[PDB]
Design an enzyme around this catalytic site. Structure first.
Site, PDB file in Angstrom:
ATOM      1  N   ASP A  62      23.802 -42.153  -1.183  1.00 27.31           N
ATOM      2  CA  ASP A  62      23.752 -41.274  -1.283  1.00 27.31           C
ATOM      3  C   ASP A  62      24.188 -40.077  -1.385  1.00 27.31           C
ATOM      4  O   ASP A  62      25.305 -40.155  -0.320  1.00 27.31           O
ATOM      5  CB  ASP A  62      22.306 -41.075  -0.992  1.00 27.31           C
ATOM      6  CG  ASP A  62      21.212 -41.898  -0.934  1.00 27.31           C
ATOM      7  OD1 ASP A  62      20.406 -41.981  -2.433  1.00 27.31           O
ATOM      8  OD2 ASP A  62      21.250 -41.847  -0.153  1.00 27.31           O
ATOM      9  N   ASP A  91      16.367 -41.722   1.775  1.00 29.84           N
ATOM     10  CA  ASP A  91      15.303 -41.030   2.561  1.00 29.84           C
ATOM     11  C   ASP A  91      13.255 -40.899   2.200  1.00 29.84           C
ATOM     12  O   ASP A  91      12.547 -39.778   3.331  1.00 29.84           O
ATOM     13  CB  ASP A  91      15.248 -38.997   2.545  1.00 29.84           C
ATOM     14  CG  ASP A  91      15.818 -38.988   1.292  1.00 29.84           C
ATOM     15  OD1 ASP A  91      15.846 -38.976   0.397  1.00 29.84           O
ATOM     16  OD2 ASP A  91      15.048 -37.961   1.621  1.00 29.84           O
ATOM     17  N   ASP A 105      12.541 -45.328  -1.187  1.00 34.23           N
ATOM     18  CA  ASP A 105      14.022 -46.172  -0.239  1.00 34.23           C
ATOM     19  C   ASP A 105      12.902 -46.590  -0.460  1.00 34.23           C
ATOM     20  O   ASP A 105      14.215 -48.194   0.079  1.00 34.23           O
ATOM     21  CB  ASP A 105      14.438 -45.118  -0.218  1.00 34.23           C
ATOM     22  CG  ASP A 105      15.736 -43.884  -1.903  1.00 34.23           C
ATOM     23  OD1 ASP A 105      15.771 -44.283  -2.333  1.00 34.23           O
ATOM     24  OD2 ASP A 105      15.381 -42.869  -0.774  1.00 34.23           O
TER      25      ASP A 105
END
Ligand code: NA
Length: 994
Positions: free
Chosen positions: A351, A703, A707
């Site tokens: 990310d 997170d 996910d």
């Protein structure tokens, strides 16, 4: 009812045949419960202690050992004599190792927590429904809730099921959905249907998701789904359906298990086929019982000599130590077998926000229109310094500090940034710096108004805390904020309706201030502000605006742009439904363009470096970001992921583009991609699949609960320190600091640790080889047993285990990060290495027998019977060779064994030095390169002397202290192993390196 969001409130009531005012009836409750089940994720498997203990005896090698303990036990029973305090030691020792082994295995499981069970932390115990059998609300258990139930939630409640909102009782309703959508700020909910039946969670503005929390308000709704059918329940199913393969070393070690098992059995047959001579013997005469005691005695030692009994403990010790070492570098690893896999990582998907970037927002540029006259146009572009949220910095036009206030475009620009904003500042006296309150992007706007000071307010006099929100507070007093129209992705803007503050009896002067993504905002502008004056928006001036925005977002600035505008003639307050978010774009039209601000989320200082390390290490890097495509790419060029001027057409994808590609092409795209922008809920997970179809070892950051599936799928799931406990429990590793660089460092640590593991693995197994040779030679030479199982077990667990561990501290190769990822298929021991350790084995096995034999022959303390060859008889039923003298039990003298054992011990200490480097001579890489190894050897020798002198032990092991002569021989026969490997390494350096 899976599609509830796209249905009207009446359709959901109709579908379930339920009354919004009475709720379900007791018959409906029963039927619904029978059809849909209880409201709860299923229980984890009933893995019992008894079953757990059983699993500790499943591995092929522990079976062999158990078997060998049984034989050992039967022998230490079906044996005559009185010395029992030195008979049952063996079988007990073997059993004790298996008990400790099984003990530990069980201790591991009691302490292991799975992510699927962490999900249940988000299911509340209780919920509140209306049912027909009562008037007032009833609080029942959340598992008793069912689809169709009319339910009530209020601030502080944890949503018990997936619920379609029927009626919002309070003024507004706010939800904390952080755990499911990554929207960390509370989101506003409505009751209107959401048209797209394939809406992602983020846009179901009319739904409450089981596991989320009400942040504010009170609401009534109808349960659309429960159990495994809710959003988190579907997440649970994905996770449960995920099968996780064994790490490369685990797999290869399990292969060695089968192979060694097959080896052990062959050597037993080999010992059979060597004694097929006994078939040609008279049926009478000789002892058959003793003949079988002979085979089973060697079968036991043979199994014991062949298993690297201490290997699992050494590995663990190494991994545990490495782990403490990685935690010092911010890498919290959760599973010990992950440390190996981390070293093989061939792809890292990260990310952007907060991992590759700091997530500390700052406005760096802004512009207004300066003048429009026919085909001519000029903007006023400015710059702003200071990259913290602190209100310290300045505005500059062509680097020259200007005064915002002298520009009217800027007065308004600031009025929008201040009013059209749900965030603020706060000076934290504890840390002594300014901290944000709200969103990053919004606080940057708050910060920007403070630096701008459009009204030259007396600010320098104010304290530190009061300074925080001073210029803002000023702008607030100028306008009453009547209400706000929240941001939605359909329109990609927000607005606030404001009326003049000093106003007694008026109904004119109202404004809307609009903030948002430039394209849509600018398309809805019919007017452009020029100071205080206003003119029509024209084709040319539009391009001018857009070209600058493009340049700022897509150039080396990599700035996230925001257009600001105001509606001069906003619709009458009465003419607006603040409930139909689908009408918000409409209320935000016929706008006047005021200006643009460009903000930066800076790359972490280490990222540039860390990305380059990966290119050296042949590890690909993929960025997953929420930026649009152009900016995504621009940031990729900026950080090193892309070359500044290289082609990327087929290496960057948005979610849209990626969905449109057919399955084959998606898989294709994933092999070459380095940038995914605007990625869908299912993408990380599909991206991981495709990556695995090319046998990539994949690292994936995440997170939230959403996910979790990808985290579980990837070989190294990586969670943020600052992330949800669920994402953590789903990951192989947690980043204490959230920094991408922590990942790269932990990969380097993994390579370093694997290189050493290969070393102590090869050291130990090679030790077993010599042990097997020693047993085999003794048998196929009819000699007295040179080594016994209790002795082997001591050496494999204590004497060698210490150096094996010390080998884990072998210094790392300088060129570690300069080689590609290790292939998972790479064999541990193969080719030349098989030969080396075969020859080394040979020599060790010979040296130990020969050490015993030398005492039996060319030494004083024992018979000087040279070439007498003890081979011939071990029955003593003829008593031929030693004619004069009634002695025949010298064959069991503890001196020869002690010679053999001290040779083994001494050789293996020497071979621990040969293990400092695979191919480099002790001339090039000296012993003292690893002080831990030197220390370890001194310890192991002190321990050998311990068993030699400390009374109970020398009896238990069957040993006697050696003469300086005998010790001096032990050395003569041990030291040459060093020369042997030096020769073999020489052959590897000079005649194989091609
Ligand atoms: Na994983």
């Amino acid at each position: 009812m899976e599609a509830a969001h796209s249905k009207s409130t009446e359709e959901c009531l109709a579908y379930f045949g339920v009354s919004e005012t009475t709720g379900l009836t007791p018959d409906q409750v029963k039927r619904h419960l029978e059809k849909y089940g209880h409201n709860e994720l299923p229980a984890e498997e009933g893995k019992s202690l008894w079953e757990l203990v059983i699993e500790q005896f499943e591995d092929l090698l522990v079976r062999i050992l158990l078997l060998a303990a049984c034989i050992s036990f039967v022998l230490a029973w079906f044996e005559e004599g009185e010395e029992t305090i030195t008979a049952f030691v063996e079988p007990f020792v073997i059993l004790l190792i298996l008990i400790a082994n099984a003990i530990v295995g069980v201790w591991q499981e009691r302490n292991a927590e799975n992510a699927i069970e962490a999900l249940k932390e988000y299911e509340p115990e209780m919920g509140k429904v209306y049912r027909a059998d009562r008037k007032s609300v009833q609080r029942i258990k959340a598992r008793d809730i069912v689809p169709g139930d009319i339910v009530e939630v209020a601030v502080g409640d944890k949503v018990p099921a997936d619920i379609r909102i029927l009626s919002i009782k309070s003024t507004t309703l706010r939800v904390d959905q952080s755990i499911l959508t990554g929207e960390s700020v509370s989101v506003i909910k409505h009751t209107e249907p959401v048209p797209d039946p394939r809406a992602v969670n983020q846009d179901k503005k009319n739904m409450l998701f089981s596991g989320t929390n009400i942040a504010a308000g009170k609401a009534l709704g109808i349960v659309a789904t429960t159990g495994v059918s809710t959003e988190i329940g579907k997440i649970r199913d994905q996770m449960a359906a995920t099968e996780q393969d064994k790490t490369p070393l685990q797999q290869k070690l399990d292969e060695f298990g089968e192979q060694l098992s097959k080896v052990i059995s062959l050597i037993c047959v080999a010992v059979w086929l060597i004694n097929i001579g006994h078939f040609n013997d008279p049926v009478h005469g000789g002892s058959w019982i003793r003949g079988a005691i002979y085979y089973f005695k060697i079968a036991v030692a043979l199994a014991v000599a062949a298993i690297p009994e201490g290997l699992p403990a050494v590995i663990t010790t190494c991994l545990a130590l490495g782990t403490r070492r990685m935690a010092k570098k911010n890498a919290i690893v959760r599973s010990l077998p992950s440390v190996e896999t981390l070293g093989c990582t061939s792809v890292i998907c990260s990310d952007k926000t907060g991992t590759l970037t700091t997530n500390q927002m700052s406005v760096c540029k802004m512009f207004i229109i300066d003048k429009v006259d026919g085909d001519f146009c000029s903007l006023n572009e400015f710059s702003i310094t200071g990259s913290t949220y602190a209100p310290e910095g300045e505005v500059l036009k062509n680097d020259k500090p200007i005064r915002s206030g002298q520009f009217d475009g800027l007065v308004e620009l600031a009025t929008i940034c201040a009013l059209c904003n749900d965030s603020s500042l706060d000076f934290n006296e504890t840390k002594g710096v300014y901290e944000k309150v709200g969103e990053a992007t919004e606080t940057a706007l708050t910060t920007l108004v403070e630096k701008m000071n459009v009204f030259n307010t007396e600010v320098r006099n104010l304290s530190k805390v009061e300074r925080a929100n001073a210029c803002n507070s000023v702008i607030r007093q100028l306008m009453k904020k009547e209400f706000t129209l929240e941001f939605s992705r359909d329109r990609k803007s927000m607005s606030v309706y404001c009326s003049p503050a000093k106003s007694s009896r008026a109904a004119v002067g109202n404004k809307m201030f609009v903030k948002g993504a430039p394209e849509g905002v600018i398309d809805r502008c019919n007017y452009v502000r020029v100071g205080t004056t206003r003119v029509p928006m024209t084709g040319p001036v539009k391009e001018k605006i857009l070209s600058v925005i493009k340049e700022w977002g897509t150039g080396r600035d990599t700035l996230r742009c925001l257009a600001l505008a105001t509606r001069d003639t906003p619709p009458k307050r009465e003419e607006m439904v603040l409930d139909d978010s689908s009408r918000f774009m409409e209320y935000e039209t016929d706008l006047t363009f005021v200006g643009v601000v460009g903000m930066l989320d800076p790359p972490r200082k280490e990222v540039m470096g860390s990305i380059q390390l990966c290119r050296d290490a042949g590890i690909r890097v993929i960025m997953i970001t929420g930026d649009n495509k152009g900016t995504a790419i621009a940031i990729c060029r900026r950080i090193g992921i892309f070359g500044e001027n290289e082609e990327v057409a087929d290496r960057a994808y948005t979610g849209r583009e990626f969905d449109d590609l057919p399955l084959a092409e998606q898989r294709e795209a994933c092999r070459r991609a380095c940038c995914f922008a605007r990625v869908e809920p299912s993408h990380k997970s599909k991206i991981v699949e495709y990556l695995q179809s090319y046998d990539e070892i994949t690292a994936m950051t995440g997170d939230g609960v959403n996910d979790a599936p990808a985290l579980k799928k990837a070989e190294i799931g990586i969670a943020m320190g600052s992330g949800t406990a669920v994402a953590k429990t789903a990951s192989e590793m947690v980043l204490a600091d959230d920094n991408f660089s922590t990942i790269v460092a932990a990969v380097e640590e993994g390579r370093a640790i694997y290189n050493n593991m290969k070393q102590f693995i090869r050291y130990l197994i090679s030790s077993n080889v010599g042990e097997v040779v020693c047993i085999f030679l003794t048998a196929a030479l009819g000699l007295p047993e040179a080594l016994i199982p209790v002795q082997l077990l001591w050496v494999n667990l204590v004497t060698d285990g210490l150096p094996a561990t010390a080998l884990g501290f072998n210094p790392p190769d300088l060129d570690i990060m300069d080689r590609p990822p290790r292939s998972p298929k790479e064999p541990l021991i193969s080719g030349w290495l098989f030969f080396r350790y075969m020859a080394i084995g040979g020599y060790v096995g010979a040296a130990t027998v020969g050490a015993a034999a030398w005492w039996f022959m060319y030494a004083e303390d024992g018979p000087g019977v040279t070439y007498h060859q003890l081979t011939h008889f071990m029955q003593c039923t003829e008593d031929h060779p030693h004619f004069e003298g009634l002695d025949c039990e010298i064959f069991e003298a503890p001196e020869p064994m002690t010679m053999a054992l001290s040779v083994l011990v001494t050789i293996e200490m020497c071979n621990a030095l040969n293990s400092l480097s695979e191919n480099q001579s002790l001339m090039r890489m000296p012993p003292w390169v690893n002080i831990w190894l030197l220390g370890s050897i001194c310890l192991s020798m002190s321990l050998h002397f311990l068993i030699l002198y400390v009374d109970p032990l020398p009896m238990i092991f069957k040993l006697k202290a050696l003469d300086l002569t005998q010790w001096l021989m032990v050395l003569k026969i041990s030291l040459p192993v060093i020369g042997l490997d030096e020769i073999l390494k020489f052959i590897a350096r000079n005649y194989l390196e091609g």
